[PDB]
Write a protein that binds this ligand. Structure first.
Ligand SMILES: O[C@H]1[C@H](NCc2ccncc2)[C@H]2CO[C@H](O2)[C@@H]1N1CCOCC1
Length: 330
């Protein structure tokens, strides 16, 4: 089997991407944030505190003839931005772009933090990291990809995120027309439950390439590119007037500046992030100070190849017995 679904930026800045997901019988279609940095499928629901729902489409398990309450199961998750959600668990039928999993754990939110409430375009998350990170207690549950893997033509999924444009998540096959050149594969550590890999280095603009190992995770659920302070300083040094602002919470730059590209290494291969991918617009409405899309990972404790990086590539998440990651230019 295979599945294929279009993923869409939620706003003009590509702050996140949503992908339609069918849940239950008859189908309830929710637009979910596919997140390769976490492993819970959770949704706004009929059980979510009314004051915490503001525009989202909700899952109503009582209207799904295939929904079954998972007795005694609860979940609670917190993300790197301080956001959180929690609730109980159903199993139900879940389909993504024609690919169907029966008995998928669907985690129904009773509570969500304010940042989720405020984001009307995101109806929940679909985690695609390794199932070891799933928060369902007292019995941990499997991700959608884990549940589908054995039925797929090939045990893989691919992320093809667009810059200010639609993109695609495919399951079970590699679309050889979606990229240029070759896919370079690189080793993955699953020891922290992430798609964790080691970049071979970087370049800033037309600068010489610096060979240096950068360990980080491929995370579709993070907007920006988070890299070591040394690297990030080297990047913003090439932008006149850029500086790190504590008040704003990172590097900002004059909106009139021309941003240099940023290149990261995958083995001997190179992925080039165009400069305008790194522009996240005025820090507040009407400001001529803009927020940078490359930021220091010093506070986070881990390097994150988020959407800013991933949308510059066609990315293969290979879930073979020994998982690997593939990157191609596009
Ligand atoms: O990018 C954010 C994510 N929200 C993106 C977002 C979604 C929707 N609208 C705006 C932003 C969530 C998931 O992991 C973190 O929090 C991630 N960062 C990690 C390190 O820097 C701090 C936060």
């Amino acid at each position: 089997s295979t599945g294929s679904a279009t993923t869409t930026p939620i706003d003009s800045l590509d702050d996140a991407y949503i992908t339609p997901v069918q849940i239950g019988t008859p189908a309830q279609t929710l637009n979910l944030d596919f997140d390769t940095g976490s492993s819970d499928l959770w949704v706004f629901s009929s059980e979510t505190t009314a004051s915490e729902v503001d525009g989202q489409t909700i899952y109503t398990p009582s209207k799904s003839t295939t929904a079954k309450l998972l007795s005694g199961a609860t979940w609670s998750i917190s993300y790197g931005d301080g956001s959180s959600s929690s609730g109980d668990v159903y199993t139900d039928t879940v389909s993504v772009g024609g690919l169907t999993v029966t008995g998928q754990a669907v985690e129904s939110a009773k509570k969500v933090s304010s940042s989720f409430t405020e984001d009307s375009t995101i109806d929940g998350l679909l985690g695609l990291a390794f199932s070891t990170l799933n928060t369902v207690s007292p019995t941990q549950q499997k991700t959608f990809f884990d549940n589908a893997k054995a039925s797929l033509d090939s045990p893989v999924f691919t992320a093809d995120l667009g810059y200010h444009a639609p993109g695609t998540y495919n399951f079970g096959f590699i679309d050889t027309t979606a990229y240029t050149g070759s896919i370079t594969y690189t080793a993955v550590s699953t020891k922290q439950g992430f798609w964790e890999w080691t970049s071979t280095g970087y370049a800033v603009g037309s600068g010489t390439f610096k060979s240096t190992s950068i360990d980080g995770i491929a995370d579709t659920g993070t907007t920006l590119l988070y890299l070591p302070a040394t690297v990030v300083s080297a990047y913003w040094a090439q932008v006149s007037g850029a500086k790190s602002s504590s008040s704003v919470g990172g590097y900002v730059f004059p909106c009139s500046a021309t941003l240099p590209s940023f290149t990261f290494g995958v083995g001997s291969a190179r992925i080039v992030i165009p400069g305008d991918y790194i522009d996240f617009g005025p820090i507040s409405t009407g400001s001529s100070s803009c927020f940078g899309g490359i930021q220091s990972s010093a506070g986070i404790g881990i390097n994150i190849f988020g959407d800013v990086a991933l949308k510059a590539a066609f990315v293969v998440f290979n879930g073979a017995t020994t998982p690997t990651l593939g990157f191609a230019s596009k």
